[PDB]
Design a protein around this ligand. Sequence first.
Ligand SMILES: NS(=O)(=O)c1c(F)c(F)c(S(=O)(=O)CCO)c(F)c1F
Ligand code: NA
Ligand SMILES: [Zn+2]
Length: 258
Amino acid sequence: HHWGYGKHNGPEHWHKDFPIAKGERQSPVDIDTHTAKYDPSLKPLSVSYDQATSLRILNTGYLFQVEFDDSQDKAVLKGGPLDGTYRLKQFHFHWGSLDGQGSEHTVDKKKYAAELHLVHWNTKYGDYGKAVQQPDGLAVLGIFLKVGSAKPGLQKVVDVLDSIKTKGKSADFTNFDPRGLLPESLDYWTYPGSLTTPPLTECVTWIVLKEPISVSSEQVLKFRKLNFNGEGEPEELMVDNWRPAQPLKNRQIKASFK
Ligand SMILES: NS(=O)(=O)c1c(F)c(F)c(S(=O)(=O)CCO)c(F)c1F
Ligand code: NA
Ligand SMILES: [Zn+2]
């Protein structure tokens, strides 16, 4: 009886194994665009993915993730609200059973069909496992997906998903360029928060881009053919793997723009 997304082990139950679920800096949150404050001291984000080295794609039983070689300073995120350098470790998505839900963050209560998270860890902490013990250990870049035109840079990901249908499957996934997943603008909101899955650690500086990317109905329908179950177990489609918005509490969301 591990955690997951269902009636019996979903977000409303996680607090019993992970009491920080009721903490003061939980994610995701609703971004109220009217109350987010423009902060002229923020910088433009620096997204430097030119040397990114993807290695593998994995169905974790909760989502799928594309992992990178983060044993050297290749693909990094800096600037914006961040102090120092954050190295890209992996990206993953959360998505819905229907095009009207699936994102973790919301914008003026709007839900998007999915949300991409690019997870980076602060190199001052030496590796990821140390970084997630720190209040400024991770920086997660969040990008909304809406359904419309296909995203060409997503198709390599979509087409390998049939090889990782079930929990614990991986496949080689080299030479994938995550720049193809980024919208035109790097305008963003930022706030201090948490992992959105157990253990829900409060170690994340969230940077959520305002501009969603467009993906096609067929691309997101291929996400929904993944399975939460292992091979040889009853089929449970991997859909609705998002945590709802959590209370903002004593936090301010800052805007990098207008
Ligand atoms: N959705 S999210 O981006 O907040 C997220 C992470 F990025 C994340 F890294 C973890 S983790 O548990 O440390 C394992 C993944 O690297 C998470 F638990 C987690 F929830
Ligand atoms: Na190395
Ligand atoms: Zn995530």
